[model samples]
Target: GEELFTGVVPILIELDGDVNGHKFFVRGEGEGDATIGKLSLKFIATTGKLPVPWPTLVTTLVQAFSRYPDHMKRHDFFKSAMPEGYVQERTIYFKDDGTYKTRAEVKFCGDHLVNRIELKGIDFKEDGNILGHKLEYNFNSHKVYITADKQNNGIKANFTIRHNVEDGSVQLADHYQQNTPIGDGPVDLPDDHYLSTQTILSKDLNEKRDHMVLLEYVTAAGIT
Candidate 1:
């Protein structure tokens, strides 16, 4: 009674020192109802300078759902149930004491890549006439995607988010964008190596049966 497209969104996390490490913060409790939405919050307060220059903090706190260990290696019958190399699987591994990061990797079928974007401006309302649609921000539907800082160690502002794709067609890719300078809890900008935000392919949504999945990372920092 299960399908490829799911209704629940996913958020993932990563760290600086990979390979192996103790648990800084293991998977904890899920919201009362684990079906729809769950408010994931992480508050980080830094006492000094950021650990690194370029940081991209993104990870999912949706869940670590365990399923059939050998579903992918099952017989031809169950194999026919699922795709050749497609199976729902995910495991979380928290870092000890480096940096907190979370990134979304959609584990769905028929997912694809559509578009990518990053931005920084003194005014969003500030608009002008340009090409029919390109070379400017005019349409109300136009948007600005801001991601977490993945190179430094901070709380609250550190986490990941999973996005559902309605037109599944994709892979886990990344785009290099400059990071924005903030207080970072210590001194603002002390240098010129802080990246504003980084973009990633959350998941692929295929046009088929209906499945729901979406999550968000709410963050707020003290600048004074």
Candidate 2:
């Protein structure tokens, strides 16, 4: 049985040393729990500058979640299940106070969503050992690949996603590789590897209902 309810969740935010704080301005009254449920209206995130702040990419993401409780379910599955060739897109950037900044470009295809992310003035370094970082992801395949020139944090990683269309289970594995100094030159060595993340979501075509496993992933491990 589904629980029916309604209410609003407000988020108050303030600068580290500012005199005043601001409200997220997101309110909703409907059925669903904080973990998984539905909302008639919601405030996801703010974008752009003052006098014209708008919703961020999170808005679409939340809406998608409402349609599909499984977080790992991709946009393609949603679009495929709903309307064919549907699309959604958003671009946003934010810099509250410090040198740190973030930006992203998101767009949808026939069967999936893609996001290109950029971050600057952060401690996390990618493949090239640079302060700025770049990342790419495809929601349909749940694939993410990252690289940077500046290796201050020794950050270089890759991911593999396997989707079981029959069972609607997504398997994820991440490989963390670092540069090592050998006698002749530098060689890339695998540091920490993990394949312990998964999400299971399936839909019954005849019944028009989605089934889920209370625990998405069961067994997970990897090599160092």
Candidate 3:
């Protein structure tokens, strides 16, 4: 019980041969109170040791983070639904191309709270056609368990395309599989490839958990 009063910091570990780097940060919001009122995490290409160049990878991973806004990826029709928490924190941006981007606010969803993440390039914006891919997820949980669905099971629809840059109009004009010279897959998966994970919560602990755990109060508002 004494440990509960003194918040503990998480130790991040890269999975075997994975390139992604993960880091967790928690800060006590109130003085004399050992409570981490805010917990934030950064999942970056640098953490994962991904092989692609930084800018390109940022462009790519953003796509993978767009799917789970609705908890599943196979939706034909859609709305710009907000993530679990659209109040506390949110980010929205755009790329040089006509791709619209937004990371929905962190909100309570499923068992854990999720941050909205999305990317809509020319291929998927105008005609609402999915060109490459889209995905989304949250990274933190009050509970210490990882489920099968939380393990990055979002919808994904990818197709081949040629970067069409002409007259300041960047579009995916070319499509078809055989058009590329090399096969599919990125150049270097990096050691972090083995570390590629959406579920970083520690799944095992020797200490027995009772009903009134450390963050039991957070669930008062109806967790998930």
Candidate 4:
């Protein structure tokens, strides 16, 4: 048997795409199946053709809220809950009076409309009283509060998605509070919690790509 000598070789992969567009592609190339011990990949691009970041962030918050427990939306008194289904609605505001009107509807079966949540609002009601919910949003500030609503008698949650106009850093916050009230007093209860989750998108102009990172922190105290 003849012995042959072989050395360790590295394969270089180059990644490229639009960071703002949130899309990327990778390409691999090697010279004679061998390279140095080091490999470098670069991402470079310019103004992305993708839509604004708020839309995607809004959709993400909606999907996240959808996973909340049934009791959050409906009363816990019901013994059996109906299966999860699609919800559709349209909000109308009168020009004369500036009053809000809604034509919301729900469907259980058959082809449904876009089940994904958007930048609207959802309310919770009980016994002719607005139990606890004012899920409203605005895009005026640096930290845009997209959706803020309360659960039933358990927890009230607020969602805020922050977007950096200078850089491409985005952060999402989930603020939760106990829904219990103290003897007709304010529902100022401790044990409040918040989750600040952030995603950083670093762009490489020469290489045409975006780097993303997910960081989330949860604490019993409110966000300082």
Candidate 5:
């Protein structure tokens, strides 16, 4: 098969819509060499419930730009973990104060009313074979201190996707990557891996994804 895009430029994609009476939004942006298994997608964040769970969604996303989908998503892509070559650091957030303007917007809300989900596909230190994760909460903690630099290195990010119940204005944030000693997720950080923590909600967030999301808009896009 011919490579549809072979330039070193970045690719960005944004799409938002409804699925099975629920809203689905996706945003993916990155620049990498598909010829090699090494991916450089700095950040990929998908919010709302989907046809499949977030984990599967991540695999599907990776499959799109990869020559070896099996090796790209997981070692086998079907069986055991099998020392997966790919690594990712994910963040899950829930907001409590999401609205849809009126009554009509209520019934067709998304899985997580107000939610923020992210998937990462790039490593700065060029490390591999690791898993990283974190969960968002209202209460700030000392755990996420000094900002993360394992991938982002505190670089200024470009315009992020805009969502429902939110201003249409393009958003911005700082890209921070780190493999800190302590985090808020269940899995422990491996020595060679960390995650990209890019904050989308610059101002105060509405607040648990459970009941606060409007799910009116789901955007899935690519970046370069």
Candidate 6:
């Protein structure tokens, strides 16, 4: 058996202490292995700021989980076996708090749904006032490619989204381009990060079969 190429996408975030610079990353497959069953969001937190204590970031994530119970209950999957079989995963960098956070959510309408919501929260300063930001990501197509097998099948979706900032003057919105994976590839960027797998052979599968796995990757930056 061999792994297939899934997909790739770009991610942008805010940093905590380094308020002047933006956190940039290349998501999907930096872990060198493809995942299965779940949609995994990955990122690389980069900074010119000497060093940020790892513990502070971890603490922030630990606290963020508290905010889920109320929010997670609002989604569609929690309502039923809504998810046919795919898993959901997310990673975030608390730009202001230096908290590296990751979450696992359920999605059935692929990645884009009025019901499907993805976002990152980090503390940052605007006008010298502290604020929180959410990178609310959504796609258009209701289907996502899940299997990396040559069946050329996986979770497929498109979206129109808003990067809502608690302090910013206005919300930012954008739409995703169409996906055109001829076969299979990596599925790890922030937008496509949820598309995870279990292997990363980068070779076309000699045999095609459907399988479920969660692809895991980390984002290096956590800028807002």
Q: Rate the local accuracy (lDDT) of all candidates.
A: 0.21, 0.24, 0.21, 0.23, 0.24, 0.24
Model 5 worst lDDT window (10 residues):
99-108
Question: Model 3's lDDT to the true fold?
Answer: 0.21
Shift in Å, residue 179, candidate 5: 38
lDDT of 6 by residue, 166-217 (tens): 3443332222222222223333212221221121112124513211111323
Model 2 worst lDDT run, 10 consecutive residues: 11-20
For 103-145, candidate 5 gives per-residue lDDT tens digits of: 0010101211111223332221112111111212111111111
TM-score, candidate 2, is 0.20
Cα lDDT for residue 127, model 3?
20
Candidate 4 regions off by >4 Å?
Answer: 1-50, 54-59, 62-115, 120-151, 159-161, 167-190, 202-224
| Model 1 agreement with the true structure over 32-149: per-residue lDDT tens digits | 1122213332212122221211111222222112121232112111112221221111122211112222333222234321111111111111121110111211111111122333
lDDT of 2 at 12: 19
TM-score of each model, paired residue for residue: 0.19, 0.20, 0.20, 0.25, 0.25, 0.23
TM-score result, candidate 4: 0.25
Error of 4 at 61 (Å): 4.0
lDDT score at residue 115, model 4, on the 0-100 scale: 22
| Cα lDDT tens digits for candidate 4, 156-214 | 43443332223333323332222222122222222333323322233344543432221
List candidate 5 segments past 4 Å from native. Answer: 1-7, 42-52, 62-224
Q: Candidate 2, residue 37: CA error in Å?
A: 22
Badly placed stretches (over 4 Å) of model 6 are 1-37, 40-42, 47-158, 168-170, 183-224
- Clash count (model 3, backbone only): 27
